[PDB]
Design a protein around this nucleic acid. Sequence first.
RNA 1: GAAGAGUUUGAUCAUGGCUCAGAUUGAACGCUGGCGGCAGGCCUAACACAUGCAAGUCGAGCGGAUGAAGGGAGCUUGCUCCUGGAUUCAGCGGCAGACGGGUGAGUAAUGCCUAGGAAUCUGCCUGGUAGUGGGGGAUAACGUCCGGAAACGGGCGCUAAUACCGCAUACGUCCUGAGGGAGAAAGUGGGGGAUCUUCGGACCUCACGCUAUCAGAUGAGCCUAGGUCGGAUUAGCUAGUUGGUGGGGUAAAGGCCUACCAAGGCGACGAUCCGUAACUGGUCUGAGAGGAUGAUCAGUCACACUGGAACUGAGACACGGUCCAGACUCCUACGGGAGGCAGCAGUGGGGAAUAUUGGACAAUGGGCGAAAGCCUGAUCCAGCCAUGCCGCGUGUCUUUAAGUUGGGAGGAAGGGCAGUAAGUUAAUACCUUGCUGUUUUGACGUUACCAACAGAAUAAGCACCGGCUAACUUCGUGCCAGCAGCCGCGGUAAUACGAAGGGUGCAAGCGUUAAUCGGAAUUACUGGGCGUAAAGCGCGCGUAGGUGGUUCAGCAAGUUGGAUGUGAAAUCCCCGGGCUCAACCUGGGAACUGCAUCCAAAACUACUGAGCU
RNA 2: AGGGGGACGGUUACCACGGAGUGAUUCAUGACUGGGGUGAAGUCGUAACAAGGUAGCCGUAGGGGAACCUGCGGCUGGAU
Lengths: 86, 76, 120, 78
Amino acid sequence: ANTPSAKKRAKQAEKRRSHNASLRSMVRTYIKNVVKAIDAKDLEKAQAAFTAAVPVIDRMADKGIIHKNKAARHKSRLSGHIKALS
Amino acid sequence: RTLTGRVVSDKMDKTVTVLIERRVKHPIYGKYVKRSTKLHAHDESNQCRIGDLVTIRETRPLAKTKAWTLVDIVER
Amino acid sequence: MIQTQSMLDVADNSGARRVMCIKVLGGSHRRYAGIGDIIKVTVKEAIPRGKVKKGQVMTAVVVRTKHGVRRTDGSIIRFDGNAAVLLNNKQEPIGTRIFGPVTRELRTEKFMKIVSLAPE
Amino acid sequence: MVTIRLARGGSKKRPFYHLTVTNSRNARDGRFVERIGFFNPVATGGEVRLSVDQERATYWLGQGAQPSERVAQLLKDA
RNA sequence: GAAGAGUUUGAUCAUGGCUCAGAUUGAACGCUGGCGGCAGGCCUAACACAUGCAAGUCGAGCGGAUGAAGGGAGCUUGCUCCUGGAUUCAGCGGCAGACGGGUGAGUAAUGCCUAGGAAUCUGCCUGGUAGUGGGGGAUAACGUCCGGAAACGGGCGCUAAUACCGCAUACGUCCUGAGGGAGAAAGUGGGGGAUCUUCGGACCUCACGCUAUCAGAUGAGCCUAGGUCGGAUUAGCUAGUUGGUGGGGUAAAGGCCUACCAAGGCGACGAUCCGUAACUGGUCUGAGAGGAUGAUCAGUCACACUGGAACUGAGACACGGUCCAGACUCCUACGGGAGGCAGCAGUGGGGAAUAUUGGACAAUGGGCGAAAGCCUGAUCCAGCCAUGCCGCGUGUCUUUAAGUUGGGAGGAAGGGCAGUAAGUUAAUACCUUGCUGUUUUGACGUUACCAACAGAAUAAGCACCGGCUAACUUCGUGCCAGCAGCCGCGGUAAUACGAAGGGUGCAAGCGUUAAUCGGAAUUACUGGGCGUAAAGCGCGCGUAGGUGGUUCAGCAAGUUGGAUGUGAAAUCCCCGGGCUCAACCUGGGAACUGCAUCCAAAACUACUGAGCU
RNA sequence: AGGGGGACGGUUACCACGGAGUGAUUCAUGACUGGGGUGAAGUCGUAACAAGGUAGCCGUAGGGGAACCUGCGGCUGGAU
């Protein structure tokens, strides 16, 4: 059978998965709204929308749910097309 | 850091394939045979036609089955 | 299943995929068999290696009918598909697994092995 | 994880060590990073005890490897 | 550093196959057995698996369970109210479980091996660079209820932190790189005299922790070139295929994912399909070339009943994890549940054939820990088996082995402790730590090994004997019965077959069944053939290709020399060191004919150019 | 109040296993057959080896219980 050393981490993994599922989805809905902002072509809300997102993309990267250079790309992808709105 | 082959197909943009030929020995037969090697070379500006001779450089891969770029058209 | 020539799925583990009733057992001019009744089958279709082979006169308990079985309040329980469990000459099941539901008219003194394996 | 460690060669009831530099990701007797000199606690006449060369032994202490427990008090035999 | 015989014929010669000497193995089988040391022991069913064990660790990370003692109050030594704190350890939390271990099923190519290449992460480790402040919401244990015989589920209600979430804060670190924006942490224990007081706290101080980065070590991931199994009685395959950009995405490049644009890509140097197989260092026979080959050993790969899938984590698509599906199996009190030995034993079952439900963490590791230590079927080491490989013994009046007794090293590095000195200290006040000398203690195998004792008491077997094997009477049997590798032998004096009677091979082993290479120039690169022995298409035109008259000059691809990194360690080859000797063990080198890079060379070849007949 | 943001939802692509139809390609088996090999050889026979008692042999059509005959082009591996 299995050991209570592993039965303890049965709870310690899936409960931790549930916290890491939400915080991960709390990232990518902020990026979707600043792609909805570019797809609406309105800079006048797009500037205010991803400056709400950048404190979330790296704050999650700082605590090891995701990696810190996944943030570094998405901070450089969204800015390289908001500049294209000109 | 220098590999040389003659151009055999150029009908795609930014990409060319050459025959980097060689003549090396057969191990148990002794007769030096030719062994053709058909690399893919990436062109930045697509200036190579069929029958040209080029040299290439290795870098990070530029596509699948392509990790070599164009250095210079040596001759034609 | 209910009568002869009727063709019916196989609810237990090993062997057949389709059996056909060739005789309803019980009485003399007995013409129907519902859930809990004993029929005589032949194996019309089977898996490549199992405990029964194609073309084999065997005995099976009817576990799951489309005509259904009625309860004492008047309620009926009625399935989508005909199915039997093949038996040996002990009238004990051959397979070690039962697939699909069964009814509580089958948890008698002879067929509670089928009930104890079923995912009812 | 990088470690300088006694590693059993030799025969049964005939110990011989290599003082391997290992990774603690492997076994005792496989995939060492470096063998610096040996050890032999059954040393009798003509057999040198330990071939510890401090030319390389400085480097893994310099690059951050550790004695295990006994490897510290073989360097204390100097 | 290389040995051939026998056999086609009345005889010969030549071509050509057979059988034979040898050495070998992971060994069987038939026989008979005294011992030591190192070894090795499912080659078949990646077949199914009862049973115990193979990774639990931590209270000095946090709440909460239980009360060693001791000093006292009553009753009067029975008892508890207390006071206290010794201790444990199921529930949270950190780390590990991604290692050690096993097996070789899948894989014909990016798996392995050799060389190189850059567009990346790495917990613990090691050097610095900057930093540990202030808060907030939950949550198990616990309380009870419900369902259940139990296993377990799932309803609310409590509480914690080295568990989590904001806020503060930014030397790097990320984005824009103009300016600017962004985002971190946790505290616990051993102490401490002055001021704040409950010198519980605060502050001071080291120790383990914690964080934000850089450089490194150590792993781990991509990418290219090379080669890597049998077939054409498999010749066409290919559409996300081959490129292009926009985006999307991976820790990281990349049709990896995507939309649309174009019609490319692969392949006769063997594509695709088909059968087969982990690969390599190496191993075995060999003069070598090679050929065969991957058991112990070590590197990489791959798998975990079968298949798909992510999750958590530094690291997995995780062997004693979860999820789903399948096959199978099991407990049921019919409510509901559980299992995966290719982990060590062991069991069936298959097979010619392969071991003990062992001892201990004392050595070496690891895994947690401030440290003590705690666990480990990895390991150290033991039974079992002539299974090799060595030695050794069975007597020529010694007593070796064996057995009795008495002795007797080496495997132990250190831990406890209580001084002693040191240097971080703001205060060598004090803790904490490294040093020193003494004391205390801990060996699974418990012995090897030395020296006494009784007495040859306890030890040999096997196969052959016609030839070319220089071991070579007869008795029984009569073309019977049989033996044998090639000839053959037996049909009535049998050196060929069955005993006895002797020898001989080499010995606790001897033989024969099987497989490998060899001799085999019998697939001939080294190193063979083709008028008649086997073998010239019936001959042409000619595609790829193989090779190419002639001269100067040039190139430096092949060729040639040196340079440097390697070609892991092991194995082997010499010199040694040791076991009392040999195996075995290692130290030193030698070896590794290889690979690319680098410069030097220009007789010849290709290529380049002008020519020459 | 609520908002932001999560969670269960709803359904959309992707896919393992399963299903269905129709084919390929392999392996085992199959009544019954057809040659092949080795035997032991009973048999019609004499087919080859001599100029083998009709010279053999090869291709091919053609024909016939068989070991076998003519033709057309073919060869001496054909000798007096």
